[PDB]
Each structure stands twice: as structure tokens, then as C-alpha cells.
Amino acid sequence: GVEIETISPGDGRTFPKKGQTCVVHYTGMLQNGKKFDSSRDRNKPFKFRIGKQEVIKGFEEGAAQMSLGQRAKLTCTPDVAYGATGHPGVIPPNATLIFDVELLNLE
Amino acid sequence: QRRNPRLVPYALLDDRTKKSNKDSLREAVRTLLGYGYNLEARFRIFRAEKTYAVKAGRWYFEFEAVTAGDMRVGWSRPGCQPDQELGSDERAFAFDGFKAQRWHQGNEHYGRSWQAGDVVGCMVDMTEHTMMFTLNGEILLDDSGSELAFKDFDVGDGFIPVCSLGVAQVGRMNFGKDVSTLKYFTICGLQEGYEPFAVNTNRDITMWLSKRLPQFLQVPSSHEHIEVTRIDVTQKSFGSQNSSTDIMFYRLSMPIECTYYYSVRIFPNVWVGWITSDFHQYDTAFDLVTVTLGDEKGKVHESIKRSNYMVCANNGLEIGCVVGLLTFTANGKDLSTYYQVEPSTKLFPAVFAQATSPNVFQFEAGLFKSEHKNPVPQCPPRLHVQFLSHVLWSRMPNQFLKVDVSRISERQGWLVQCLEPLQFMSLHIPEENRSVD
Amino acid sequence: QHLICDNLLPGRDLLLQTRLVNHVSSMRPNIFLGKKWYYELMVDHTEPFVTAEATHLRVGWASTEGYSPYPGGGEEWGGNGVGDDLFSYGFDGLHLWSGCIARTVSSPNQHLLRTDDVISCCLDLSAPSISFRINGQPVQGMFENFNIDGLFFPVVSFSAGIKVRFLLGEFKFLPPPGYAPCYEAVLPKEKLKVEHSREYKQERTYTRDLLGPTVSAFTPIPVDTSQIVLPPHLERIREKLAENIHELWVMNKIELGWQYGPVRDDNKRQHPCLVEFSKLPEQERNYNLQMSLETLKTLLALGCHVGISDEHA
């Protein structure tokens, strides 16, 4: 259970299935609003395969319930996210994450 | 009276059908003196960047006088304050364009008044300790037969082109780069051994106007009588006896986000509350969140918050207990005005007050100073050197935002449109939260 | 080198964390408001991202006695709804703002701010309410019981490649609900000019103009001359000249030809008020017998000295 707030509507019916690549442009921030990641910044659309346990499970499950052109404001749970270990340097221990993700293309 | 289309005061409506009521008593007056009864009746400062403070040579710039009132134009040392007003110390070396005098620790006449649509001009020798102005091509003279207006200064850290405005005045200053808009340089200047600010620069010189919004600052040793004394429970004393001690809004530095309380000690009119990170409301009064619900049909629409500036009034130990949410105790009495609404906000400890007596305020179930820093077992309270006792001060200058927006405006439907994205480079101090670029 | 990065870095609390954001400018159509009023906008451009960050466009009202409009560099990120003197709305995912805190109101579309949308905002006169609508659909309007001081006016802000059209008259689409459009607060003498929301800039290559601060609704203050009692020597003297003042209401009406009638009907020549001042009571000549009293007290009480000198008649 992660909070998926839709922002813009896409087309809804063509959703990403299991076993495809996901072209996502995404910008992540902490709960406090401080920005720790982007993809508009580095200017490369992100890509990953569903199910291969590459991206974190909150990002994966929230990218599952979208479609083409739809953008979402995921509010991911820290226990589904990096957890109490967090990440040494970027993410503090047990902080909620706010992703603004947007799909562009699939496979 | 409903749907009244004339629901405006006297200042704007059609008084020509009321001129039958005006001229009724303009001709009825002729029935009085034919009978024998007659009748018989704020100040903003403008300056350039401190890094341009030239300390050598012969320099000149000009000012255009547009409208009426305060036109004060001169050259000041880099230590001049915009918290005060111009001229009334040894720092500012300025000329009063109106009232025909010159300001340096006082008043003494010089030249004349301006005209509407003028070009003043001011020239400064830095090697030589003289300073001669001009006006509209004419050099300005003193009462003592001298164009050498300001003499015998001290060459410290150079002198910046300053200015001042009043209430409804419009100004125009030119720091060079615009030789085609030099209206009196060709007769005075290059033929007098001077230089504009056009001599080298390729950039647009940044201006530092004063700031309307008061945002707080450290408590220095700079007041007639204000001295917080850092003491070891572990209070912070005071003393504020002067001739002008109306209102100073005090606050600590570090906030509490979203278990401990906070004690003051007063003899008497003096408020105690909590400031959220935007409080630039200077007022000698009592004034000011209130947004409802929305449940997709309405039907509840009650409230969200209570805080937006929290209110209270031998020993008055009024106490802002926190968390959870906010409440107040007063000398043991848990009084009314429970301000128990804050979702995830930051709250500054705060005191708004007058000054009657010296040694009047203090500060600090355990105590408080765990909940700020990172170590939080910390049940023995402890003061720290980062804990400051800020005072809300009035005017610290701002930068000028050298390129703004390339907007256009239309009327037929009122199209307003810009297409050129500019960007800041903003850094915000995390614990005294405010965004500076 | 790992150890500093694990401890000092990720707290974002000891150092001076930084960012960059887009410049924000606000515009208002020189209106003021000291029943319920109603203004519109039609947003005709979208641009969700023309930066390495999101773009914003907020609509709403403001006040005027407080928060000098400093762009970005003052309070947080500049703009609309970021202070207490600002009550704003509008987003893709239309969650609103008030005092730089976002709250999350709903509507069963969750539209963008596209090229083909219209806002529907309102403000109550003599009531503290502001309610919005998207395409007429209720957004569950929110703002109740904030400050009533100064004057209220729409200060829409933007930072994108976005064009918008003030539907303010040149109305194209608006519901009417309640009663006022903002084309009526521009009725008597003022025009429809749009400025840069208190304008401390005049972006010119040669010299920006400079400014002074400000200098400053149908409930004015009248003048009162009741408690300056006339002497009974000048009281009859006024009614001597009022005896030859109500005949002037015949003198400009003996040319008009609306003669006497026992009923009161001016549009068909019935007029019971041709008899002079002291002979008619304060019933139908009350408009010309009580009229001369208090309007002549202040004739000798507003400084205009007319002493008891010659013969009033």
C-alpha cells in the first residue's frame, strides 16, 4: 500500500505489463521538500524492467498503476523504500519519499 | 436600496444631476447677501554595490529630477545604513536637491531647488578632498561664493553613489554606459578632469535599494540600551531604558517542527507566543490559519488550523507548552486559547513586547533544550552558543534582480505572456528558515 | 571520507543547502475592492516542463496592506498564496495554497492547467468567503474568515511559457452566480490597465524608474452639524431667507408646467407643493422645509461668519 495520487490523466487502458521496460521521467524529494534526485536535471529519461528487482519496490509498484502520459505523485512508505538503513549520504534513516513520476514510453 | 447601480461614494459618481442640488444653493446665496449675510472661509534609499566603492580619482554621475518632494542625491561611505534616513551622521555626503541645501551632519544652504525634468549631476574628487556638484549644466554655488561644495573629508573605503526618495517621487540615475544619454557631460566632466562610470565596465551595475519587509537579525551591541545577558534555569536577561522604547518584537533562533515547555518571568501589555517562519508584520497593535474542509460535496467544511503570532498577555510566568499540539499555561493556570493545530509546521519561540522597566524579561516535568538539537535523550537542559535572542529590525537592503521577465501585454482579451525562463540560484539556511539567492 | 558523508551530509541541517528555481512575476488589472464579486481566466498555454524543474501558474486574490511583492528572493519562492496576505489556487492536480503551505482539495476530473480551461473564482463583498470552480464544477471552495483589511484584487502569478486571457470585459464565458461581475468596480472613471503587481521594476536598458511607497468601498464619512444649535435670532433669520428659498423651488418649476394636485404625481402634472415655506408643513414640503435648517446651521458654523447684521427677508 503506497499513496498514488494521479495528477494528469493519460489514457488509462494501455498500462505497463510484467516484462517490459519503463521510460520514466521522474523527480524525487524528501518529506521536507528538499530535492535529492531528478531526471529533468541530468536530462536522460530513466529506464528499467519491471519485476527484475532493480528499482525499489515502491517506485515499481507505483509505476505499475499508471499509463502513457499520466503523471503521479507517489508518497512511498519508508519500509517499502530504503528503510532504516536508508542510504549513506543521500537519504536519512526512515524518511518518506515524494516522487513525481511520469511515463513516456514502454515496450 | 436592492440592486442599487449607484453604490459608490461622493468621490466618483455623476454630480451633474446633483449640480441641480449644487446650484440650488449657489443662487440661494444671493438671497442672503442681498439680505445682508455673506460668507468667508516610506523614504527609500537607493545605492550601488559595495564592491564598486572607488577610492581614487575624479568621478561623476547624474540624476534626473522628475516629480516633487524628496530628491536627495549624493555619495556615501560603504558603512551607511538604510535602517535610518540619509545624511544625519558623518557617513553620508549628499546634496539636497530640494530645499537648496546640503546634508552632512546637518543643514546649510547650497544652490537652489531643482526643476521638473532636470539633470542634476554630482562630481567627486577622491585624491583631492573636494566635491563640487552641478545642476542642469550650471555648477552649483554655496552662499559663500564657492562651487567647491563638500571639502575636507577622510578617504576611507571609498564612496558609493547613493540616493533617497520620499513618498510619491520618481527617480532616474545613470552610472555611465549610456554616453548618448549624457545631457550635460559635454560642458562639464571631460573638460574638468573627471570620469563617468562608463570607463571600463561591461556589466550592469547592481543596485541595492532598501527592503520594505522587516526580517529579523542578530542582537548586536548596537542599541542605546538593549543588552541580553547570557546567564546560567539558564535564563536570558534584559535592560531597555531609553527615551524611545515603543515596541520591539523578540524571538529566538531555532524552531520546533512537528513534550517540553518554556518559561518567561515578567513583573507586569507584554505578549508571549510562537512565530512561524514568515512573520514580517510590523505593527503596534494586535492583528493576525483559517481554511475549511472540502469533502467532495462540502457538508462538513469546518477548519484546518489555529496558528498563523500566538497570543497571551509579581511574576508572570506565562508558558507556551508544546506537544502533539500547542497549549498555554499562565502561572500555573492552564488558561484558554488552546492553539492546538499544527500539521507539520516549524514554530519559533517568541515574545512581543513594549519596554517599561529594565531587567524585565527572561527565558529558560523536565525542560526544553533537548527538542532542538540532534541528541535527544538530553533531559538535563543546557543552553548553547547557537541560541540567539534576535530582534526584528527594519530595513536591510536587497539586490535588484538584474534581468526580470520578457513579458508582453495585450488588451483584446488581455493577453499577458512571457516565454523566456530565468532561474535563481537559491540557498536556504535550514535552521533559521529563509530563502536567499 | 565515507564517514563525513554518512554523518555530516544527509541531515541537510548543519550546512547551507542550495537549489535553483524559476523567476515568478505577478500581474493584476488595476482593480480594487474595499454582493459577491466574480472574475475569470482562460489559460491558453500549457508548458508542464520548460526547465529542469516543474512550472507553476496560480490564480487568486490578495490584499494590499502588507507583503511588499518581492520576487522569489523575499519569502519562499515568491508568487501566489505564499504569504498570509495571499489566497490562491490552481495546478495540474488542483491542490491550493495559502501562506506557502499546500492543501489538497479535490474535483472529479483532476485537470491540468491546459490550453482549454477556465477557472471560476469568486469573492464575497461584506462576507469573508472565496470559492473557486473549474468549468463550473465545484472545487469545494475553501477560504473562510481570514483578514478583512486593505483591498482585494486578483494577482495571478506564473512562471512558464504560458499565455492567459483576462475575461474581465470582452467577456466571453462566465457563469453569473451570486451578484457581481468585476466589470462594475471599474464603472465610473478608472480604466482597465494591467501592471506588474506593484512594480518596483521598469526594465529599461538605460535607467529603471524609481518609486515611492503608496498613499492610502461605499461607506464614507459624512459631515455633521446637528450639535451646533442656532440662536433664535438667527433661527427666524434663516427662515426669513428660507421664506424666499422655497419660492425658488417654484421659480425653477413655474417653467416646467406641473401644476397643483392633491395627489403627488410629478409625471402627469400633480404637485401639492406650490405654496411657500412657512405655510406648508413637514409632510410633502419636508423636502424643502427641513432642508433649509441643518444646511444653514453649517453656513455659519463651518467658519463662514455671517453675523447678525442686515435684514433677512
* DSSP class of C73: T
CA distance C248 to B69: 48
Query: Residue C237 corresponds to which cell in the numbers above?
Result: 433669520
- Phi, psi at residue C89, to the nearest 5°? -165, 155
Q: Are A57 and A79 in contact (CB under 8 A)?
A: no
Closest CA to B162 of B154, B171, B152: B171
Resolution of this entry, Å: 3.7
Query: Residue B205 corresponds to which cell in the numbers above?
Result: 551595475
Q: Are C87 and C60 in contact (CB under 8 A)?
A: yes
Query: Residue C196 corresponds to which cell in the numbers above?
Result: 506588474
CA distance B65 to B46: 15
Q: Are B165 and C211 in contact (CB under 8 A)?
A: yes
Query: Residue C261 corresponds to which cell in the numbers above?
Result: 394636485
CA angle at residue C248 from C242 to C252, to 5 degrees? Answer: 160
What amino acid positions of A are annotated as catalytic residues?
26, 36-37, 56, 82, 99
Closest CA to B50 of B395, B394, B397: B397
All residues at 6 or more sequence positions from B234 whose CB lies less than 8 Å from its CB, including other chains: B364, B381, B382, B383
All residues at 6 or more sequence positions from B371 whose CB lies less than 8 Å from its CB, including other chains: B256, B259, B260, B322
Q: Which residue in chain C is spatially nearest to A27 when comparing CA positions?
A: C53
The amino acid occupying position B295 is: D
Total residues belonging to chain B:
437
Give the three-state DSSP class for C251: helix
Chain B residues in contact with C75 (beta carbon < 8 A): 213, 278, 280, 434-435
Q: In what order do the strands lie in the sheet with A3-8?
A: A3-8, A71-76, A97-105, A23-29, A35-37
DSSP result, C145-203: S----S------EEESS-EEE-------S----SS--TTSTT-SS-----BSSS-----
Torsion of CA A39, A41, A44, A47, to 10 degrees: -10
Q: Say which of C10, C49, C53 has its CB closest to residue A90.
A: C10
Q: Residue B428: which H helix or E strand, with range?
A: strand B427-429
Query: Residue B248 corresponds to which cell in the numbers above?
Result: 520591539
Burial (CB < 10 A; 0-12, 13-18, 19+), residue C136, is exposed
CA distance B417 to C166: 12
Chain A residues in contact with C110 (beta carbon < 8 A): 6-9
Q: Would you report the helix, strand and coil content of chain B in percent, each value rounded to 5?
A: 5, 20, 75
CA distance C276 to C289: 9
Task: Inspect the interface and report whether the beta carbons of C218 and B8 lie closer than 8 Å.
Answer: yes
For strand B415-417 and strand B408-409, is the pairing parallel, antiparallel, or unpaired? antiparallel
Task: Inspect the interface and report whether the beta carbons of B424 and C73 lie closer than 8 Å.
Answer: yes
* Chains with 3 or more CB pairs under 8 A to chain B: C
Could you tell me the CA-to-CA distances from B364 to B138, B218, B264, B388 in Å, in that order? 65, 19, 7, 13
Neighbours of A99 (CB within 10 A): 23
Closest CA to C244 of B21, B38, B34, B23: B34
Q: Are B119 and B62 in contact (CB under 8 A)?
A: yes
Chain C residues in contact with B301 (beta carbon < 8 A): 140, 144
Closest CA to B124 of B76, B163, B156, B185: B76
Q: Which residues pair with B160 in a beta bridge?
A: B76
Q: Are B193 and B60 in contact (CB under 8 A)?
A: no
CA distance C120 to C132: 5
* DSSP class of B64: E
Q: Are C160 and C47 in contact (CB under 8 A)?
A: yes
Q: Which residues pair with A101 in a beta bridge?
A: A26, A72
Neighbours of C115 (CB within 10 A): 13
For strand B347-353 and strand B273-276, is the pairing parallel, antiparallel, or unpaired? antiparallel
Chain B residues in contact with C32 (beta carbon < 8 A): none
Burial (CB < 10 A; 0-12, 13-18, 19+), residue A3, is middle
Which residue of C33, C43, C84, C88 to mutate against B (max B Cβ within 10 Å)?
C84
* DSSP class of B343: S
Query: Residue C310 corresponds to which cell in the numbers above?
Result: 442686515
Q: Which residues pair with C163 in a beta bridge?
A: B417
- Phi, psi at residue C130, to the nearest 5°? -140, 125
Between positions 115 and 144 of B, the ones with CB within 8 A of C are none
* DSSP class of B374: S
The amino acid occupying position C115 is: T
Q: Kindly report the nearest CA distance between residue B220 and chain C, in angstroms.
A: 23
Q: In what order do the strands lie in the sheet with C102-103?
A: C25-26, C157-159, C56-62, C86-89, C96-97, C102-103
Q: Say which of B10, B36, B298 has its CB closest to residue C310.
A: B36
The amino acid occupying position B423 is: Q
Q: Sign of the CA dihedral B99, B104, B110, B114?
A: negative
Q: How far is CA C21 from its chain centroid? A: 32
Query: Residue C139 corresponds to which cell in the numbers above?
Result: 472545487
Q: Are B252 and B409 in contact (CB under 8 A)?
A: no
Q: Residue C3: which H helix or E strand, with range?
A: helix C2-7
The amino acid occupying position C214 is: T
Q: How far is CA A34 from its chain centroid? A: 16
Task: Inspect the interface and report whether the beta carbons of C6 and A89 lie closer than 8 Å.
Answer: yes
* DSSP class of A89: T
CA distance B23 to A87: 85
Q: Are C73 and C22 in contact (CB under 8 A)?
A: no
Method: cryo-EM
Neighbours of C128 (CB within 10 A): 13
DSSP result, C5-47: HHHTSTT-SSS--B---B--EE-B-S------EEEEEEE----
Q: Sign of the CA dihedral A60, A62, A67, A71?
A: negative
